[PDB]
Design a binder for this molecule. Structure first.
Ligand code: 2VD
Ligand code: 2VD
Ligand code: CA
Ligand code: CA
Ligand code: CL
Ligand code: CL
Lengths: 359, 360
């Protein structure tokens, strides 16, 4: 196995396949075949593969090398460096300028593969749309809940919409985006680590994303990268049951102003329970907080509200999470009563919605 | 006690006094003779910041939680007016339609440092003190049992001020002339105190006044006064570890040398970090290997005319020096494989670094 490639063509591929990395799981599989260098990283649950065209002379073969060390070596070389690689006995030699390195290898035959599987559902969409869908909801996934199905994100196809749902039992985020293709009605759960990796592969360019879903796997092709993950078992909740049936009390306020006020009130909220109370009245919102030391905060804001007066408590962190996710001018809070969830949205888009349980 | 002040006139003061019993998590606030004073302490050191009060005020003193008070003021909007008044056991804070009631502890209970007399004094520019500390800070020990190493030596001699730091393995020294006749004296400043001193300096046009006592040090700059205890101990003599008449001077661009060392370091022993240098006519070869028998080699052009030699060093210590230097070219002053190396900015002898030889 031999290849010579410019540093600039290896960096991002190495970054992508090595980021999240059986000592052999700490290695990258390298394969030179048919004028292509393939780089693969896996943790047995998911896999990233990068392809890199080889325009200079090369020789076929495969090996595995320590991912972090190989990446750090390549990153450490100067801009414009050309990196010559060749296998020599048990070691992989890496040469650039008068910098030389000899890395240990493990046999390519030992590198684990995911099970083969069939694609049942496919569609393509812009990168910017997948980014939007993931960023809108990702913060609301559970982290290590014993309900394993919540440690991850729902990807649902319906009509021509792709929808993501994330919830941890206390708060929920949902976002739907049209993708201009007839889709079957289908849902899968992607594990939270796979969601993060998928997000990280979205470079910001105009390369479209191709998605393939099987019964136990999801795959995403973007540019010269292929990401594959297993799915999570279990019955995900139905976001329509979490959305308030009829939250017909509508409050509108500046996002930044609202966030600032909550963030200040939070300072004097209970350090564990983070409770704040909201008093809504005609064109006015009052937020209060207090803690076991009897310290107290009060914020009063102008808002647009024409409904009945009411009072409700929330965990302020959950609300701040939403407002930070929104990135918009004005927010709409949609209320039911003092003992029911609240729905929050961008006042100028219903494309994402957030639900927070009351305290 | 009452005052009203612009948010932006409190932020810097609040940053500075938060730097140093639960009253130690409070700040002492005092309104007197046109001035708000804020004090934070950890009983070892203390910072006092003064804010001029141009709006109506009323005298008095209290203490409030530092983190919460600082967070409220920082969270308030740009340009906000902050009105504070003491209401019984609470301190009330208001600005626009935001109101806060904070718990207080009596000012009477706020601890003072022991009184002391100044014995050595001098004034220098902030940039000079900043250079002195930054040049050497990284070589101070952290929680070493030799408590006298967990800090920095400040030494006055003639018209110069010198700092020394060492952890028992490597050493940094920096000396700057400060244009005033000083007694020959030295003290050890605790590492936490060094960091706080460093951070009180903005590099601006206010002169820094330093006062040293038997057991304390104080630094006054503009509206801020820092006071710390000294470390009551004996510091090692830096002159003892400086190599005698090193006659083999290697010179190279700092960044090229640094990047070579950083790449080589990847395949060095994770715990002991040894790398080898082979010096020859205008050439440096650096090698590294690890227990798994992986190997790195770097060859660079340098300026070097001395006898050929080999020497090993801890690459983390060498990289620490190169990162602190932030200069164009470096000088490595070599002697032989069993002697230390002295490293300097090629264009300046004001800072010097000593690293020990490793056998491999
Ligand atoms: O009992 C539930 C019901 N539930 C649930 C979810 C959810 C989402 C929102 Br925004 C509000 C309530 C939700 C989503 C996850 C559902 C599940 O267990 O599969 C249960 N959640 C509690 C928290 C809770 C307790 C009492 C009242 C409301 C919420 C929990 O997950 O620990
Ligand atoms: O004193 C020491 C250990 N030591 C010590 C210090 C020191 C600083 C540097 Br840059 C390098 C070595 C240091 C400073 C702290 C000394 C102490 O224990 O108080 C020990 N070693 C000498 C050997 C030696 C001689 C000359 C120069 C360096 C080291 C010995 O054990 O006799
Ligand atoms: Ca705006
Ligand atoms: Ca929606
Ligand atoms: Cl270099
Ligand atoms: Cl070596």
């Amino acid at each position: 196995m031999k290849f010579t490639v410019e540093r600039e063509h290896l960096l991002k591929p190495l970054q992508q396949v090595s980021g999240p990395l059986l000592p052999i799981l700490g290695n990258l599989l390298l394969q030179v075949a048919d004028g292509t260098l393939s780089l693969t990283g896996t943790d047995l649950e998911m896999e990233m593969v990068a392809r890199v065209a080889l325009v200079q002379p090369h020789e076929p073969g495969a090996t595995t090398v320590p991912a972090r060390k190989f990446f750090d070596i390549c990153r450490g070389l100067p801009e414009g460096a050309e990196i010559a690689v060749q296998l020599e006995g048990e070691r992989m030699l890496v040469r650039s300028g008068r910098s030389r390195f000899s890395l240990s290898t493990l046999p390519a035959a030992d590198f684990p593969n995911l099970d083969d599987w069939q694609s049942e559902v496919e569609f393509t969409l812009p990168q910017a749309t997948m980014k939007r869908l993931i960023e809108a909801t990702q913060f609301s996934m559970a982290h290590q809940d014993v309900r394993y199905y919540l440690n991850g994100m729902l990807f649902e196809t319906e009509g021509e919409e792709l929808r993501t749902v994330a919830t941890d039992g206390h708060r929920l985020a949902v976002c739907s985006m049209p993708i201009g293709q007839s889709l079957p009605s289908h849902s899968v759960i992607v594990p939270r680590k796979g969601v993060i990796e998928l997000m990280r592969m979205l470079d910001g360019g105009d390369n479209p994303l191709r998605v393939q879903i099987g019964s136990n796997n999801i795959r995403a092709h973007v540019g010269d990268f292929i990401f594959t993950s297993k799915l999570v078992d279990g019955r995900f909740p139905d976001y329509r049951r979490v959305l308030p049936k009829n939250p017909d009390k509508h409050l509108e306020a500046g996002c930044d102003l609202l966030k600032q006020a909550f963030a200040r009130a939070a300072i004097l909220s209970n350090e564990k329970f983070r409770g704040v109370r909201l008093y809504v009245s005609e064109n006015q919102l009052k937020i209060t907080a207090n803690n076991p030391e009897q310290e107290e905060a009060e914020e009063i804001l102008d808002v647009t509200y024409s409904g009945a007066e009411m009072e409700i408590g929330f965990n302020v962190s959950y609300v701040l999470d939403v407002l930070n996710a929104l990135k918009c001018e004005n927010v709409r809070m949609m209320l039911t009563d003092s003992v029911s969830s609240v729905q929050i949205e961008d006042a100028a888009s219903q494309s994402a919605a957030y639900v927070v349980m009351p305290m």
